[PDB]
Design an enzyme around this catalytic site. Sequence first.
Site, short mmCIF file in Angstrom:
data_model
loop_
_atom_site.label_atom_id
_atom_site.label_comp_id
_atom_site.label_asym_id
_atom_site.label_seq_id
_atom_site.Cartn_x
_atom_site.Cartn_y
_atom_site.Cartn_z
N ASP A 171 24.21 -46.13 3.31
CA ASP A 171 25.02 -47.21 2.74
C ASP A 171 26.51 -46.93 2.95
O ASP A 171 27.07 -46.04 2.32
CB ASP A 171 24.72 -47.38 1.26
CG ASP A 171 24.65 -48.84 0.84
OD1 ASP A 171 25.63 -49.57 1.09
OD2 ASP A 171 23.62 -49.25 0.27
N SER A 211 26.07 -55.78 0.50
CA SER A 211 24.91 -54.90 0.61
C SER A 211 23.58 -55.65 0.56
O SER A 211 22.55 -55.05 0.86
CB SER A 211 24.94 -53.85 -0.51
OG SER A 211 26.24 -53.32 -0.68
N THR A 262 19.74 -52.86 -1.60
CA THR A 262 19.06 -52.36 -0.41
C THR A 262 17.56 -52.16 -0.63
O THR A 262 16.76 -52.73 0.13
CB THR A 262 19.72 -51.07 0.07
OG1 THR A 262 21.09 -51.33 0.41
CG2 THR A 262 19.00 -50.51 1.28
N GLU A 273 15.00 -38.77 -21.41
CA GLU A 273 15.86 -37.66 -21.00
C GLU A 273 17.10 -37.54 -21.87
O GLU A 273 17.46 -36.44 -22.29
CB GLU A 273 16.26 -37.82 -19.53
CG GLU A 273 16.95 -36.60 -18.94
CD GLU A 273 17.04 -36.66 -17.43
OE1 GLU A 273 16.30 -37.45 -16.82
OE2 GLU A 273 17.86 -35.91 -16.86
N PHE A 310 14.03 -40.96 -11.85
CA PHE A 310 14.62 -39.71 -12.32
C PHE A 310 15.88 -39.89 -13.16
O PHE A 310 16.22 -38.99 -13.93
CB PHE A 310 14.94 -38.80 -11.13
CG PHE A 310 13.74 -38.46 -10.29
CD1 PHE A 310 12.79 -37.56 -10.74
CD2 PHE A 310 13.55 -39.06 -9.06
CE1 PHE A 310 11.68 -37.25 -9.97
CE2 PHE A 310 12.44 -38.76 -8.29
CZ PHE A 310 11.51 -37.85 -8.74
N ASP A 365 16.64 -32.50 -11.65
CA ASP A 365 16.62 -33.56 -10.67
C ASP A 365 16.35 -33.01 -9.27
O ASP A 365 16.75 -31.89 -8.95
CB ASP A 365 17.96 -34.32 -10.65
CG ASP A 365 18.00 -35.45 -11.66
OD1 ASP A 365 17.61 -35.22 -12.83
OD2 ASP A 365 18.43 -36.56 -11.29
N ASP A 393 28.26 -45.11 -0.42
CA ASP A 393 29.01 -46.31 -0.74
C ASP A 393 29.81 -46.14 -2.02
O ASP A 393 30.99 -46.48 -2.08
CB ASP A 393 28.05 -47.50 -0.86
CG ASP A 393 28.70 -48.82 -0.51
OD1 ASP A 393 28.95 -49.06 0.69
OD2 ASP A 393 28.97 -49.61 -1.44
N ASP A 420 24.34 -50.14 6.89
CA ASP A 420 24.45 -51.57 6.61
C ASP A 420 25.84 -52.12 6.89
O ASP A 420 25.96 -53.28 7.32
CB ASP A 420 24.06 -51.85 5.16
CG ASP A 420 24.88 -51.06 4.16
OD1 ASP A 420 25.47 -50.03 4.54
OD2 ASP A 420 24.94 -51.47 2.98
N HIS A 479 34.96 -52.87 1.44
CA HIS A 479 34.17 -52.55 2.61
C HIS A 479 35.00 -52.73 3.88
O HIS A 479 36.18 -53.08 3.85
CB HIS A 479 32.92 -53.44 2.67
CG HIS A 479 31.92 -53.15 1.60
ND1 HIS A 479 30.76 -53.87 1.46
CD2 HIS A 479 31.90 -52.21 0.62
CE1 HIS A 479 30.07 -53.39 0.43
NE2 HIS A 479 30.74 -52.39 -0.09
C1 LIG Z 1 30.95 -56.29 -3.72
O1 LIG Z 1 30.49 -55.23 -2.92
C2 LIG Z 1 29.98 -54.16 -3.65
C3 LIG Z 1 28.69 -53.72 -3.41
C4 LIG Z 1 28.17 -52.65 -4.13
C5 LIG Z 1 28.95 -52.03 -5.09
O2 LIG Z 1 28.42 -50.95 -5.81
C6 LIG Z 1 27.41 -51.30 -6.72
C7 LIG Z 1 30.24 -52.47 -5.33
S1 LIG Z 1 31.28 -51.66 -6.59
O3 LIG Z 1 32.29 -50.81 -5.96
O4 LIG Z 1 32.13 -52.64 -7.28
N1 LIG Z 1 30.32 -50.80 -7.70
C8 LIG Z 1 30.66 -49.43 -8.08
C9 LIG Z 1 31.99 -49.05 -8.20
N2 LIG Z 1 32.30 -47.77 -8.55
C10 LIG Z 1 31.29 -46.85 -8.78
C11 LIG Z 1 31.63 -45.52 -9.15
C12 LIG Z 1 30.63 -44.58 -9.39
C13 LIG Z 1 29.29 -44.95 -9.26
C14 LIG Z 1 28.96 -46.25 -8.91
C15 LIG Z 1 29.98 -47.21 -8.66
C16 LIG Z 1 29.66 -48.53 -8.30
C17 LIG Z 1 30.75 -53.53 -4.61
CA CA Z 2 17.13 -36.79 -14.47
MG MG Z 3 22.63 -49.65 -1.34
ZN ZN Z 4 26.28 -51.40 1.26
ZN ZN Z 5 29.50 -51.43 -1.77
#
Ligand code: A1JNY
Ligand code: CA
Ligand code: MG
Ligand code: ZN
Ligand code: ZN
Lengths: 482, 482
Positions: free
Chosen positions: A43, A93, A156, A218, A273, A289, A320, A361, A437
């Site tokens: 990703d 995604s 995904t 957990e 998990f 884990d 990602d 992707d 992205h």
């Molecule tokens: C619109 O396009 C997308 C697609 C997928 C996506 O991630 C789900 C995001 S996101 O950046 O806004 N979400 C995030 C942001 N910070 C994080 C930090 C730590 C752990 C997880 C995270 C998740 C935007």
């Molecule tokens: Ca765990």
């Molecule tokens: Mg994904």
């Molecule tokens: Zn993606």
């Molecule tokens: Zn993303």
Amino acid sequence: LVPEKEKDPKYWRDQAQETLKYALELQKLNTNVAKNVIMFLGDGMGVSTVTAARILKGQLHHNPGEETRLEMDKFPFVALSKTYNTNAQVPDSAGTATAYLCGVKANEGTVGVSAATERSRCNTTQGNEVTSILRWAKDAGKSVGIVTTTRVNHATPSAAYAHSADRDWYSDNEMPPEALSQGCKDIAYQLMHNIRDIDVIMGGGRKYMYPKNKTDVEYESDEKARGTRLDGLDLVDTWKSFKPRYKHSHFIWNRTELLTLDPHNVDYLLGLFEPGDMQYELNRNNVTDPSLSEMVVVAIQILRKNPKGFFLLVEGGRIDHGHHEGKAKQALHEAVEMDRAIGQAGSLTSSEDTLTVVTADHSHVFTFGGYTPRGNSIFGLAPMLSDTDKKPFTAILYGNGPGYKVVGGERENVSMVDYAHNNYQAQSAVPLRHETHGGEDVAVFSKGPMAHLLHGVHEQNYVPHVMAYAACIGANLGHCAP
Amino acid sequence: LVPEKEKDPKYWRDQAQETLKYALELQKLNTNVAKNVIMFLGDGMGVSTVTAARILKGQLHHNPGEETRLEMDKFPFVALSKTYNTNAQVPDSAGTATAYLCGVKANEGTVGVSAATERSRCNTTQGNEVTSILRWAKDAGKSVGIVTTTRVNHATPSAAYAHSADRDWYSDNEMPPEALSQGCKDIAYQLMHNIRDIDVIMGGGRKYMYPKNKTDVEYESDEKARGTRLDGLDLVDTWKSFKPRYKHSHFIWNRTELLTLDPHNVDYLLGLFEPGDMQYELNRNNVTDPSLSEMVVVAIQILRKNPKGFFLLVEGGRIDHGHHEGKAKQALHEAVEMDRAIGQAGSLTSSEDTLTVVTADHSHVFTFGGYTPRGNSIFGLAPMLSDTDKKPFTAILYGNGPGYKVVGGERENVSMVDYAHNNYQAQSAVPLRHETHGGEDVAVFSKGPMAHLLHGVHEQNYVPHVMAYAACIGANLGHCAP
Ligand SMILES: COc1ccc(OC)c(S(=O)(=O)Nc2cnc3ccccc3c2)c1
Ligand SMILES: [Ca+2]
Ligand SMILES: [Mg+2]
Ligand SMILES: [Zn+2]
Ligand SMILES: [Zn+2]
Ligand SMILES: *[C@@H]1O[C@H](CO[C@@H]2O[C@@H](C)[C@@H](O)[C@@H](O)[C@@H]2O)[C@@H](O[C@@H]2O[C@H](CO)[C@@H](O[C@@H]3O[C@H](CO)[C@@H](O)[C@H](O[C@H]4O[C@H](CO)[C@@H](O)[C@H](O)[C@@H]4O)[C@@H]3O)[C@H](O)[C@H]2NC(C)=O)[C@H](O)[C@H]1NC(C)=O
Ligand SMILES: *[C@@H]1O[C@H](CO[C@@H]2O[C@@H](C)[C@@H](O)[C@@H](O)[C@@H]2O)[C@@H](O[C@@H]2O[C@H](CO)[C@@H](O[C@@H]3O[C@H](CO)[C@@H](O)[C@H](O[C@H]4O[C@H](CO)[C@@H](O)[C@H](O)[C@@H]4O)[C@@H]3O)[C@H](O)[C@H]2NC(C)=O)[C@H](O)[C@H]1NC(C)=O
Ligand SMILES: *[C@@H]1O[C@H](CO)[C@@H](O[C@@H]2O[C@H](CO)[C@@H](O[C@@H]3O[C@H](CO)[C@@H](O)[C@H](O)[C@@H]3O)[C@H](O)[C@H]2NC(C)=O)[C@H](O)[C@H]1NC(C)=O
Ligand SMILES: *[C@@H]1O[C@H](CO)[C@@H](O[C@@H]2O[C@H](CO)[C@@H](O[C@@H]3O[C@H](CO)[C@@H](O)[C@H](O)[C@@H]3O)[C@H](O)[C@H]2NC(C)=O)[C@H](O)[C@H]1NC(C)=O
Ligand SMILES: *[C@@H]1O[C@H](CO)[C@@H](O[C@@H]2O[C@H](CO)[C@@H](O)[C@H](O)[C@H]2NC(C)=O)[C@H](O)[C@H]1NC(C)=O
Ligand SMILES: *[C@@H]1O[C@H](CO)[C@@H](O[C@@H]2O[C@H](CO)[C@@H](O)[C@H](O)[C@H]2NC(C)=O)[C@H](O)[C@H]1NC(C)=O
Ligand SMILES: *[C@@H]1O[C@H](CO)[C@@H](O[C@@H]2O[C@H](CO)[C@@H](O)[C@H](O)[C@H]2NC(C)=O)[C@H](O)[C@H]1NC(C)=O
Ligand SMILES: *[C@@H]1O[C@H](CO)[C@@H](O[C@@H]2O[C@H](CO)[C@@H](O)[C@H](O)[C@H]2NC(C)=O)[C@H](O)[C@H]1NC(C)=O
Ligand SMILES: *[C@@H]1O[C@H](CO[C@@H]2O[C@@H](C)[C@@H](O)[C@@H](O)[C@@H]2O)[C@@H](O)[C@H](O)[C@H]1NC(C)=O
Ligand SMILES: *[C@@H]1O[C@H](CO[C@@H]2O[C@@H](C)[C@@H](O)[C@@H](O)[C@@H]2O)[C@@H](O)[C@H](O)[C@H]1NC(C)=O
Ligand SMILES: COc1ccc(OC)c(S(=O)(=O)Nc2cnc3ccccc3c2)c1
Ligand SMILES: [Ca+2]
Ligand SMILES: [Mg+2]
Ligand SMILES: [Zn+2]
Ligand SMILES: [Zn+2]
């Protein structure tokens, strides 16, 4: 640096001649039937990310890094893929997942539906559903499985078994009342009902399978890890009850019991998990884990039993998230872990009857440069100062994201900070909560029967069409035609 | 946007099936002898640059852009190449040129010498000279030529015929006295002496061929366009005098007589159109200067006469300069022009006996994203505002470079400026006089005899070894062995 052996032209010429000899040997194409198909998806793993990961992996063994070979680098064939949604120039995604899993391009934010569907509009889901390569393989009589480091009901993994208008509908707790009244089921519900004989499922997302307000197994004291379902359904029990009573089914949530199973006995395995997304590789707790490689090995061991082959999908999804947070270290480590898993998978199978594809992707806006000397640390500084403000800077940078930092008209002086820290955010151009992205093409590495069909520049949806033809499944079955 | 036809899965499935049918036909490999070899090099043309150029070319015809096909996109085979110097992690334009023209990796800043040479040291150059594929083709009896939009004595064009320790020694006016005393000859001098039967030479760099203080023929009043040679040598006359007196030789500096020549009569052609580097395609004066496509067409017309084939090298060099200035518009237009030249060249030749390769020497830190809608202008804004400062931003950004602009602790209102202007500089993270290169891999597109030998991930120096084998020239001649 300039190692001694590298100062002789004969060394380079001999290496090039050996590579040419191998290429010439590769003209005897592999035209066998692909009993097995394995897809590795990274990703957000762009080309720059791949190069940085190769350098980091080389440096982890105390080498200069640039001359190191990744596991995917040993795949005989390479191609390029374009990743635009029918709705967006910079993809999401979900639409990309539909494109490379079902063979049709769709809008961003929708899973398993054609472009005729509108995001957040229930009606248009009916009559615009598209099946995935996993369904084709299962209908062919094969074994199928999904392994990922993110939530199982993420975009995904969910693009292979579900048909939804919105990607945010993980469970009924996130569905607006209008959608519920119209008769739409959430992704988590669709996981245990659309296809009821998926052999292997592993990943995160344990909070979306239990009735609301139930404490987690957990993190008992964690108030954010409780169940979310409003219909009172226990989806793990539903998953267990949908399978024959003369088979063997296991549910696991922790590393100790994952390694105690006997794959020669298990038939159906479900493993969740973490309540949400699994932890970063650098923050992983190796006691409770598992890592991606162990899950891949167990899944392959379980799947290889069926005499008609199998299809497996593996996703390294936290690259990602690492890029989104602006932490290049975490993303690079995730990529290295995925490469290790690829190596293990390659060790466990054979290329005379197995076709393996690795791809991504979409991309990101991660960049690295600065005219660094050979062997310079990937997380290090540039050799020179800035000729405009007379301050240092790192070789890694981001177009946008949370790394922006200008304390009163002046940028930061990284000399006074730990720039090699795990959670360090490289500077960026424009300040955003999350970096976005990228719209550049991605690379595809293929090895195995008929792998030469992925040769040049292709649309993303073309990827699953070749694989099916290799495995004699789906709409086209000309490979096995007498 | 979402065009109507794109809302039907059958459309995408039929397109994928057609692509698969073409791929299955490509299994009958082209194992003929490559009578001709043509190399297209895009200086700094990274994958992101290629995608942006494709989008811009599509939009120039009033299409959405993403579904457009570039000329190089039609090349059957694709591969990836790593571009690290033995001395630097982020490569230069000279060591990479040596790697992909002579087949040996060298240090940055040196041309035509192995890694045993030290930059700025004449007495370390003797005994460490490496020949180029152009010399191999010429010794095989073929015709050779060089066409570029930059100075002829620049790093990329000079890597094919010269052996120098420093890339800055365009002429004796830029050589330190120690180097001159030790017996160093500048690149411009080496152009007319190392190989004395180069059929076609075209590009810039007219000030480096004439005695110092001699006024230019185009800009009489320009003080910066005067000659620079301190030895009083007139190199154009030397070039003319080194050729047989029963052949035809022409020197041109301007578009009118470039289109008046008869290629069926000319034997040796030398053309220098600008005192230094040629102008950007957007700033070009069509009355006096030619475009890349016209030069390529004329060169191919002249070269195709020899019954034993030919080798041609074409460089689009101002993409690097455009990226260095931080002006994405100019670089993208240069890439589009190079693609047009590629199309013309493909039209003028045949793939049954000609092998064509297109690639780049390195990459940059240019990025583009922001979740833009389908069909959004490549030079447009992002759909949303920044959630941190509440100001707009563009989809194109740079890791570093002159685009940095922060007045009084606040970044810019781009909305108060013309962000679609030709000379607009996209914002960057750290302020530099020039933005730096990138260390990511580059793409290679191949079409023609034995083009399938470039299949996966390769070192840069591997590129010329396959081509030679295709043309039965150089060290290995096994293709034509009985
Ligand atoms: C619109 O396009 C997308 C697609 C997928 C996506 O991630 C789900 C995001 S996101 O950046 O806004 N979400 C995030 C942001 N910070 C994080 C930090 C730590 C752990 C997880 C995270 C998740 C935007
Ligand atoms: Ca765990
Ligand atoms: Mg994904
Ligand atoms: Zn993606
Ligand atoms: Zn993303
Ligand atoms: C941006 O930051 C650099 C470096 O930051 C430094 O890095 C961190 C790891 C931590 O040490 C921070 O506290 C530290 O700032 C700045 O470089 C400093 O520049 C100043 C002048 O602006 C120097 O001032 C010192 O003052 C003394 C003069 O009497 C004397 O101590 C110093 O000379 C001595 O420096 C070291 C001190 O440890 C000593 O070992 C040497 O032998 C030498 O005599 C010096 O004049 C600091 O020393 C510098 N700190 C360094 C180089 O680590 C930089 O100024 C700042 N840039 C801008 C543009 O603001
Ligand atoms: C960053 O920049 C934006 C946009 O810049 C604008 O565009 C450039 C092309 C050029 O015209 C610049 O001069 C111009 O700033 C700024 O957006 C402005 O925001 C202010 C504050 O809200 C608005 O102030 C105006 O004040 C009046 C009181 O209502 C009134 O005239 C305006 O309403 C009118 O708005 C437009 C004017 O043409 C139009 O829709 C109607 O005429 C309407 O009544 C408005 O309230 C400006 O109009 C805004 N300008 C634009 C073009 O939208 C922004 O403030 C700045 N951001 C930061 C954070 O500094
Ligand atoms: C990893 O997972 C395994 C499997 O779930 C965990 O073992 C489980 O541990 C609990 C708590 O000790 C056991 O419950 C106890 O079982 C018996 C009655 O069945 C009795 O001792 C108690 O009344 C209590 O109910 C549970 O049986 C056991 N499960 C299995 C299959 O053995 C293990 O603790 C986990 N390890 C880590 C480090 O998280
Ligand atoms: C593009 O290039 C051509 C070729 O160089 C230019 O034509 C050339 O122009 C010069 C200057 O006018 C001519 O020289 C003159 O010729 C006669 C005597 O022969 C006489 O008019 C002057 O005494 C002077 O010597 C030259 O003959 C002519 N062409 C050639 C082949 O020599 C043309 O002007 C250029 N066009 C542009 C737009 O820059
Ligand atoms: C999807 O069902 C919804 C019910 O919410 C329809 O929404 C209404 O549809 C009618 C018919 O066009 C309109 O007159 C109303 O204004 C719509 N209401 C809203 C809030 O949009 C929607 O049209 C249905 N879609 C289709 C394709 O029939
Ligand atoms: C499991 O994680 C633990 C905890 O981080 C690791 O223990 C660390 O090991 C590193 C590497 O040798 C040491 O530098 C640290 O000091 C150790 N920390 C502690 C608290 O002991 C452990 O090595 C990991 N195990 C595996 C097999 O990867
Ligand atoms: C190549 O020539 C240089 C001088 O141009 C030699 O440089 C050495 O170092 C100093 C630098 O000022 C000179 O004064 C010395 O005479 C040089 N000799 C030695 C032994 O240091 C350099 O050594 C020469 N290299 C070779 C291989 O002869
Ligand atoms: C040669 O360049 C000139 C000068 O830019 C071009 O003439 C202009 O072309 C633009 C773009 O189409 C028009 O908007 C202008 O009206 C034209 N005239 C002037 C005076 O600028 C000319 O089209 C170019 N020729 C070719 C063949 O590309
Ligand atoms: C979930 O519970 C929330 C808080 O109520 C009390 O505290 C939590 C920690 C649980 O112990 C819960 O059972 C207790 O009642 C409520 O605000 C929320 O409405 C509850 N949700 C449901 C579906 O009952
Ligand atoms: C080069 O010329 C310098 C300036 O001379 C001016 O330019 C020349 C071309 C003539 O037009 C002359 O009338 C002008 O005044 C000199 O200062 C310099 O020494 C000259 N250098 C050499 C190496 O000859
Ligand atoms: C060290 O790596 C390299 C390699 C090549 C190179 O270009 C020769 C540069 S450069 O950026 O310093 N030169 C530049 C800079 N700005 C320009 C602007 C307009 C026209 C021409 C330019 C030329 C650096
Ligand atoms: Ca000119
Ligand atoms: Mg160049
Ligand atoms: Zn370059
Ligand atoms: Zn450059």
